[PDB]
């Protein structure tokens, strides 16, 4: 079925399949199904035009998802970046924003290593 | 452990989150136990002397 913004989950339990929607996680998946009474264990292929529709409704109206979120999140980052805000600077400089060390591993935020030259003696160990 | 810093005793911190044990015997401020008011070093010394009642060399 196609729930939120052109989302096509399938052949998998609705609860988990629902996860493939942007703003939808293990938590909200559990919710929507219950507050709509739909056995989570049903494969999406085995849903019902009725069930499906009820689901599509709740989800797309009870929350801000997919592309709308993205734009929103990017909006906030953009937002606190337009201020002389420190966090914003980190985003700009591309470094962690939640007070973590950068002397060593801060890769996931920095990306691949851009190695360079240096000294030999004085065991850099 | 400059005398000027062994003023810790103040108890007039202005904000109690500034208080800080600090060994009574060597002024030590980095490894001071509570139950003794002594730092890890001072504790080892007097303990050996036997000037800490009960405190014996633990083994097992």
């Amino acid at each position: 079925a196609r729930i939120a913004g052109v989302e096509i989950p399938r052949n998998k339990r609705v609860d988990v399949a629902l996860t493939y929607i942007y703003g939808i996680g293990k938590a909200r998946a559990k919710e929507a199904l219950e507050k709509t009474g739909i056995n989570p264990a049903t494969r999406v292929k085995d849903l019902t035009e009725a069930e499906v529709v009820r689901l599509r409704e709740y989800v797309e109206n009870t929350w801000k998802l997919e592309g709308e979120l993205r734009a929103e999140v990017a909006a906030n980052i953009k937002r606190l970046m337009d201020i002389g805000c420190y966090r914003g600077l980190r985003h700009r400089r591309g470094l962690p924003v939640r007070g973590q060390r950068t002397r060593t591993n801060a890769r996931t935020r920095k990306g691949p290593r851009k190695t360079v030259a240096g000294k030999k003696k004085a065991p850099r160990k | 452990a400059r005398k000027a810093l062994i003023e810790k005793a103040k108890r007039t911190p202005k904000f109690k989150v500034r208080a800080y044990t600090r060994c009574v015997r060597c002024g030590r401020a980095r490894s001071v136990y509570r139950f003794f008011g002594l730092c890890r070093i001072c504790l080892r010394e007097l303990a050996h002397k036997g000037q800490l009642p009960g405190v014996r060399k633990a083994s097992w």
Partner: protein, 206 residues
């Protein structure tokens, strides 16, 4: 840099504590800072008396403070003129109605701390180190004893390069618990720095 303290190593055995008394996690530290301050004044004062040990017992605000000395004379004083001053000077520091005995050391030449102080003094007196050591061991080794040993630190005779002189007699089986070796350390201030004298006296056995 090895070897444990002979006393600390033998507390539960041949050697008892210099402070006997129970306390709770709320007073133990206090009954220590004080209990320690007691040794602070007594040491600076009863120096000449030559105080070997300074036991201290406690109870409900009670205090023993048995002071062991070679020459109890200087302690007590004229008839009793001093053992009174230093008891009122004592109880002044700690309002605990504190007793204050004055035991006498039978043969101070079996009192490691004394023997140490002795050697220490002689050193500040520009004496010859090796001699004092050899003498000390003798004096102690002569006053009975089944063994003895003395170790003066370094910077001997103000010699640029620090050394370590010692010499000893009889036995001093530091590894055997069932021994009883009075140990005594004495510092030795000088014009060219400190020196450290150490003394061991193997007295009994089982």
């Amino acid at each position: 840099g090895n070897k444990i303290h002979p006393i600390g190593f033998r507390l539960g055995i041949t050697r008892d504590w210099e402070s006997r008394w129970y306390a709770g996690k709320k007073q133990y530290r206090h009954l220590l800072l004080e209990d320690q301050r007691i040794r602070g004044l007594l040491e600076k004062e009863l120096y000449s008396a030559g105080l070997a040990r300074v036991d201290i017992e406690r109870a409900a605000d009670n205090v023993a403070v048995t002071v062991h000395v070679a020459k109890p004379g200087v302690v007590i004083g004229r008839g009793g003129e001093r053992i009174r001053v230093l008891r009122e000077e004592l109880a002044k520091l700690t309002g605990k109605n504190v007793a204050l005995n004055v035991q006498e050391v039978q043969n101070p030449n079996l009192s490691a701390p004394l023997v140490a102080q002795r050697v220490a003094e002689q050193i500040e007196r520009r004496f010859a180190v090796r001699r004092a050591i050899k003498q000390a061991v003798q004096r102690v080794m002569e006053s009975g004893a089944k063994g003895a040993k003395v170790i003066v630190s370094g910077r001997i005779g103000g010699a640029e390069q620090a050394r370590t002189e010692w010499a000893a007699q009889g036995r001093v089986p530091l590894h055997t618990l069932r021994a009883n070796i009075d140990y005594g350390f004495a510092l030795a201030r000088t014009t060219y720095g400190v020196l450290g004298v150490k003394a061991y006296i193997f007295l009994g056995e089982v």
